[PDB]
């Protein structure tokens, strides 16, 4: 239905061990499709999904050019940041960036993003209107004044609504077989006794794509949050995802509990009940 494209970059300084390492990765929804690593031998933006290899030679030259320029920009920004926070040149610092867009089922613009984080904390973010900045602290406030005066957001806006959307649209078509598929979860419930009085019920969801899913426990058809354990959705490594939800229950009361599985690959949500 709705689709996203995101680019995530990480610049990490390592004083005494040469210049900062720069790593950038690109995603369409939950599928990685490109990478660039400043420490790799190739010095090129590399394919990471089969369907991105159908882009011609000029795409790889242009994209390599872009990712290398961002690599240089964020090396400078690491130096500007030290000065703004009055930090020592000897310590290791991190500059992260994310940018990208959201499109509807019609392949039309919904939302745009362009944001930084310094040492794992919000630095500056482009607001939803694509005309203003959310600066988090005093240092980011200096950048905000600089970027607003120079009308920099118009360049972000022209990218996010244009180039970003066109690329996302072209990728969805070229990788249709992969990106526009829905792999519903394969579900099951397991039972694990604790004591003579307690047991754990674990509701599993496996082999699903996209990553978004909701697992809920209910007792007697009433929502249950107490005695619940939910693991983070995790990648299987084959392009699909996994998740589980567990509840600690009194012995003999197992069947009063139900697991509710919500996934866009499902025609209806699934309800699971322990059936020995």
């Amino acid at each position: 239905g709705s689709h996203s494209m995101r680019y995530f970059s990480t610049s990490v300084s390592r004083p005494g061990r040469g210049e900062p390492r720069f790593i950038a990765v690109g995603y369409v929804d939950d599928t990685q499709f490109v990478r660039f690593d400043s420490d790799a031998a190739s010095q090129r933006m590399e394919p990471r999904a089969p369907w991105i290899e159908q882009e011609g030679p000029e795409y790889w030259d242009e994209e390599t050019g872009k990712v290398k320029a961002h690599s240089q920009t964020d090396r400078e920004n690491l130096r500007i940041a030290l000065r703004y926070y009055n930090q020592s040149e000897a310590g290791s610092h991190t500059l992260q960036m994310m940018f990208g867009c959201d499109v509807g089922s019609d392949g039309r613009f919904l939302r745009g993003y362009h944001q930084y984080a310094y040492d794992g904390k919000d630095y500056i973010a482009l607001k939803e209107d694509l005309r203003s900045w959310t600066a988090a602290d005093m240092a980011a406030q200096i950048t905000k004044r600089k970027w607003e005066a120079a009308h920099v957001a118009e360049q972000q806006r022209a990218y996010l609504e244009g180039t970003c959307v066109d690329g996302l649209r072209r990728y969805l078509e070229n990788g249709k077989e992969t990106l526009q598929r829905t792999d519903p979860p394969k579900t099951h419930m397991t039972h694990h006794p604790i004591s003579d009085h307690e047991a754990t019920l674990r509701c599993w969801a496996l082999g699903f794509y996209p990553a978004e899913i909701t697992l809920t426990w209910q007792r007697d058809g009433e929502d249950q949050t107490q005695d619940t354990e939910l693991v983070e959705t995790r990648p299987a490594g084959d392009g699909t995802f996994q998740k589980w939800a567990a509840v600690v229950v009194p012995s003999g009361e197992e069947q009063r509990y139900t697991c509710h599985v919500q996934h866009e690959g499902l025609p209806k949500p699934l309800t699971l009940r322990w059936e020995p």
Binding site: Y7, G26, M45, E63, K66, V67, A69, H70, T73, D74, E76, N77, I80, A81, Y84, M97, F99, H114, Y116, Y123, I124, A139, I142, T143, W147, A150, V152, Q155, Q156, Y159, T163, C164, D166, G167
Partner: peptide
Amino acid sequence: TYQWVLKNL
């Protein structure tokens, strides 16, 4: 399609 990231903080 990547963006041109050229502005400084």
